[PDB]
Design an enzyme around this catalytic site. Structure first.
Site, PDB file in Angstrom:
ATOM      1  N   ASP A   7       0.851  -1.175   0.000  1.00  0.00           N
ATOM      2  CA  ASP A   7       0.000   0.000   0.000  1.00  0.00           C
ATOM      3  C   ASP A   7       0.893   1.232   0.000  1.00  0.00           C
ATOM      4  O   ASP A   7       1.664   1.434   0.934  1.00  0.00           O
ATOM      5  CB  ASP A   7      -0.890  -0.021   1.246  1.00  0.00           C
ATOM      6  CG  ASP A   7      -1.740   1.217   1.378  1.00  0.00           C
ATOM      7  OD1 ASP A   7      -2.431   1.586   0.411  1.00  0.00           O
ATOM      8  OD2 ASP A   7      -1.734   1.824   2.460  1.00  0.00           O
ATOM      9  N   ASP A 105      -3.444   2.331  -5.567  1.00  0.00           N
ATOM     10  CA  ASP A 105      -2.269   2.263  -4.716  1.00  0.00           C
ATOM     11  C   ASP A 105      -2.197   1.025  -3.834  1.00  0.00           C
ATOM     12  O   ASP A 105      -1.514   1.034  -2.811  1.00  0.00           O
ATOM     13  CB  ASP A 105      -2.220   3.498  -3.835  1.00  0.00           C
ATOM     14  CG  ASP A 105      -3.056   3.336  -2.592  1.00  0.00           C
ATOM     15  OD1 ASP A 105      -4.251   2.974  -2.711  1.00  0.00           O
ATOM     16  OD2 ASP A 105      -2.511   3.556  -1.494  1.00  0.00           O
ATOM     17  N   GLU A 106      -2.887  -0.039  -4.224  1.00  0.00           N
ATOM     18  CA  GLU A 106      -2.868  -1.262  -3.431  1.00  0.00           C
ATOM     19  C   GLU A 106      -2.753  -2.510  -4.281  1.00  0.00           C
ATOM     20  O   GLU A 106      -3.418  -2.633  -5.315  1.00  0.00           O
ATOM     21  CB  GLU A 106      -4.137  -1.362  -2.585  1.00  0.00           C
ATOM     22  CG  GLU A 106      -4.311  -0.218  -1.619  1.00  0.00           C
ATOM     23  CD  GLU A 106      -5.557  -0.359  -0.771  1.00  0.00           C
ATOM     24  OE1 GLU A 106      -6.335  -1.288  -0.945  1.00  0.00           O
ATOM     25  OE2 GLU A 106      -5.795   0.457   0.099  1.00  0.00           O
TER      26      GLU A 106
HETATM   27 MG   LIG Z   1      -2.063   3.828   0.929  1.00  0.00          MG
HETATM   28 MG   LIG Z   2      -5.096   1.899   0.861  1.00  0.00          MG
END
Ligand SMILES: [Mg+2]
Ligand SMILES: [Mg+2]
Ligand SMILES: Nc1ncnc2c1ncn2[C@@H]1O[C@H](COP(=O)(O)OP(=O)(O)OP(=O)(O)O)[C@@H](O)[C@H]1O
EC number: 2.7.7.7
Length: 341
Positions: A7, A105-106
DNA sequence: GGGGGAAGGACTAA
DNA sequence: TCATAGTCCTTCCCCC
């Protein structure tokens, strides 16, 4: 199964930092300026400098300015963040073909066939943090465990710029101690229904009458929470397929005048099809954000692909169906396509 | 009784 | 005048 979750930290803000190193150290706030009036809109995200003082994702830009009138306010540049994101994802593929990109973003990597224990995993996690920091100067938090859910919980605990492993023993520990509200998938509405049942830890889901829990939070979540409780959850990491693409846009001023909303509706279609990029949707939905914020949606499925021409005429029907079935003034208007061929 | 899909609002997250 | 994309759950509905 050994899952490794990544993340990126305060991503949008951090990216703005990378493109302007002089922002390093100052509170940075990425905003979504709605345009109806100066400083109208919400904060998409902030670095920890700003977050430390209460400025965080979701609050009105107006408030953030009252808390930190001198923080740096920047318009969100999603395209830019999306490209940086894609490059980072590619670096992640060099570590596992089995990768699930959850969001901008993961990402989850099934590294079962790459390491043999949580020690090697941990080191591989380090390799990854250094590779990214190296190639893109972006810090990320790594979470490691036996499944997607706990890998994510590992990350939530260690962020930012951290890395944590949650071995089998800690899993059972969390199954009893961990606040059930901090479990991925449990929102405020669900967290409440649970508290209204004394359920505050995953384990508490094993003692309660199923149908009782089911009738309260739904069958799916019930089975989800329980399976987690029985330390049995293990959904596979799988390539994600966006099932729908759309765009919603806020109007200068509210209204229920078809002709006045059309511009926005169509603008939303052009932007959407663009995003569709090669994809032909068989379904379409016009979505409306009423003055009071409720959401009204009406769509339709066709027996074949939808042309932009069709999308156009069709969206006006749906728009009006909404118009007639709801007497509220509209604040935001958008469209959404799905069921691709 | 249930496979299966279409529609509309719920819910998470963002 | 404070208020920014997507995935499912729940329901009715045709029908074998
Ligand atoms: Mg993040
Ligand atoms: Mg996240
Ligand atoms: N309220 C929001 N509205 C719109 N976009 C959001 C919002 N909150 C977060 N995001 C977007 O999602 C991205 C990824 O989310 P995430 O919560 O992981 O990011 P973050 O803001 O860096 O925080 P964290 O470090 O805890 O992960 C952000 O960079 C932005």
């Amino acid at each position: 199964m050994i899952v490794l979750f990544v993340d990126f930290d305060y991503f949008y803000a951090q990216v703005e930092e990378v493109l302007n190193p002089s922002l390093k150290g100052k509170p940075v706030v990425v905003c979504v300026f709605s345009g109806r009036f100066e400083d109208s809109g919400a904060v998409a995200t902030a670095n920890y400098e700003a977050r430390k003082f209460g400025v965080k994702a979701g609050i009105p830009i107006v408030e953030a300015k009252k808390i930190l009138p001198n923080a740096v306010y920047l318009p969100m540049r999603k395209e830019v963040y999306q490209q940086v994101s894609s490059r980072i994802m590619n670096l992640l593929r060099e570590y596992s073909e089995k990768i699930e990109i959850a969001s901008i973003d993961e990402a989850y990597l099934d590294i079962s066939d790459k390491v043999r224990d949580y020690r090697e995993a941990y080191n591989l996690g380090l390799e990854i943090k250094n590779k990214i920091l190296e190639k893109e100067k972006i810090t990320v938090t790594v979470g490691i465990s036996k499944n997607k859910v706990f890998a994510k919980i590992a990350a939530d605990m260690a962020k930012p710029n951290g890395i944590k492993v949650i071995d089998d023993e800690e899993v059972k520990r969390l199954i009893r101690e961990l606040d059930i509200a901090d479990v991925p998938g449990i929102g405020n509405i669900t967290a409440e229904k649970l508290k209204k049942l004394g359920i505050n830890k995953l384990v508490d889901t094993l003692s309660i009458e199923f149908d009782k829990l089911k009738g309260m939070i739904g069958e799916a979540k019930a089975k989800y929470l329980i399976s987690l409780a029985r330390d049995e959850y293990n959904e596979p990491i799988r390539t994600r397929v966006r099932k729908s693409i759309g765009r919603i846009v806020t109007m200068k001023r509210n209204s229920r005048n078809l002709e006045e909303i059309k511009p926005y509706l169509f603008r939303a279609i052009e932007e959407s099809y663009y995003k569709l990029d090669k994809r032909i949707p068989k379904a379409i939905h016009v979505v409306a954000v009423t003055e009071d914020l409720d959401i009204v949606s009406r769509g339709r499925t066709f027996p074949h692909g939808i042309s932009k021409e069709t999308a156009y005429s069709e969206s006006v029907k749906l728009l009006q169906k909404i118009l007639e079935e709801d007497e509220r003034k509209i604040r935001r208007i958008g469209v959404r396509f799905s069921k691709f061929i």
